[PDB]
Amino acid sequence: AEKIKINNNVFIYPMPVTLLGANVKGKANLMALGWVSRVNANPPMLGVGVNKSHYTPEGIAENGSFSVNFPYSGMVKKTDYCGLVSGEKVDKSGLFEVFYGELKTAPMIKECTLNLECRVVETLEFPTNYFFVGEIIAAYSEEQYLIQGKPDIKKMDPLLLTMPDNSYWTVGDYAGAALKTGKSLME
Amino acid sequence: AEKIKINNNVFIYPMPVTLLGANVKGKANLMALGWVSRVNANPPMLGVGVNKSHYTPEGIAENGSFSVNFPYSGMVKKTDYCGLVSGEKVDKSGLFEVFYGELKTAPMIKECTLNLECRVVETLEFPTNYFFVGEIIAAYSEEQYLIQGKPDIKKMDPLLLTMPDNSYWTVGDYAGAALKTGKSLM
Ligand SMILES: Cc1cc2nc3c(=O)[nH]c(=O)nc-3n(C[C@H](O)[C@H](O)[C@H](O)COP(=O)(O)O)c2cc1C
Ligand SMILES: Cc1cc2nc3c(=O)[nH]c(=O)nc-3n(C[C@H](O)[C@H](O)[C@H](O)COP(=O)(O)O)c2cc1C
Asked: Taking the domain B1-186, which CATH number applies?
């Protein structure tokens, strides 16, 4: 099969599905977020991609903090709703049970399986988006999501996202041991 | 029940599974990469998070270019191999069939399902990792991975990753229409 040139506007296959929390004018906001990735190993840093058109960036700029929150699959609707409406027009502070942590100002979602509380280290600006690089200063889960002290993805049952087809997916079958199977081909 | 604090070195659940391609000293190199995200809508830009201890950043730094390649699930072994061995000591240029694009500087993998050829726009440095921001200037797939010229993830069959438990996963079942199912709560 020959290689075909396609539209340059391609998204990652798949994206994760997260809820991004920020205080904006003292009130908790949440937006749906798929543009999240680790950036730095030590200290542990992630980055978050946010359109300049959204309400959320004002809050992240104000507070220098944000959270990354992982819903389970049964929260699909509330999650999607947070990616359909803006905090500019619609109060999203009441949709979830909100808790705060050490940074005081990054609102986190009680119902989410995992919450990463982040301190803005650097705000990167690109033509249509900010990418807020944050240090993970505290991480929260619950015992029922952990195996040997660490998050277990099957317990979490997180969502996945694909655009512009606009689909949600869940995690499928185990597919091998990472940093392991490749050793089979070594030396 | 109650929230409990766990260790701060937390990865995204799950990560994507990608092969990062660069020329180093005129020779193709590939590493496994889960630290990638889109960073700008228009023009299309992604960012890649790369340890300073790796061989690949030397190549991206030389060339001002790199590629992002999506293996399908049957490629797990060679993919993990690329995440274990460094081009510093082990030549990885022959592991896969390599093709180049418009830039002629960023090596892409024929066997992969989707190849993104990227021009570095901005390079950031953090204490242990570079963060290279690239513009997607060319994107390559095959008819067999496409619906109306658009990648279909089930045809692609890409790998997912979780760490530090170090598990690969594939994609599961359709779970709803994004930017749609949530319309009910309005
Ligand atoms: C599943 C999903 C993922 C999304 N991911 C992002 C993203 O990564 N970055 C972004 O800027 N917008 C993203 N959006 C769109 C925003 O969440 C949406 O416009 C939201 O209403 C912004 O909220 P706000 O105005 O209160 O900040 C996503 C939407 C959906 C439904
Ligand atoms: C599946 C998996 C994902 C990985 N993701 C990243 C990553 O996102 N960033 C990074 O710096 N290293 C990552 N690594 C580690 C590098 O891929 C690995 O150290 C590789 O051997 C580097 O090779 P190089 O020295 O030729 O660049 C990953 C490893 C595995 C197996």
From this structure: 2.30.110.10
**Contact indicator for A115, A69 with CB cutoff of 8 Å:** yes
Question: And the tokens for A51?
Answer: 């359109």
Q: Spell out the domain ranges in chain B.
A: 1-186
Which residue puts its alpha carbon closest to atom 1 of ligand 2?
B32
A38:B43 CB<8 A: no
Experimentally, the structure was elucidated by X-ray
Residues B153, A124: C-beta atoms closer than 8 Å = no
Which residues form ligand 2's pocket by a CB distance below 6 Å?
Answer: A 178-179; B 17, 29, 31-35, 49-51, 54-56, 80, 83-88, 161
- Contact residues, chain A, for B116 at CB < 8 Å: 10
| Resolution of the structure, angstroms | 2.0
| CATH number attached to the domain at A1-187 | 2.30.110.10
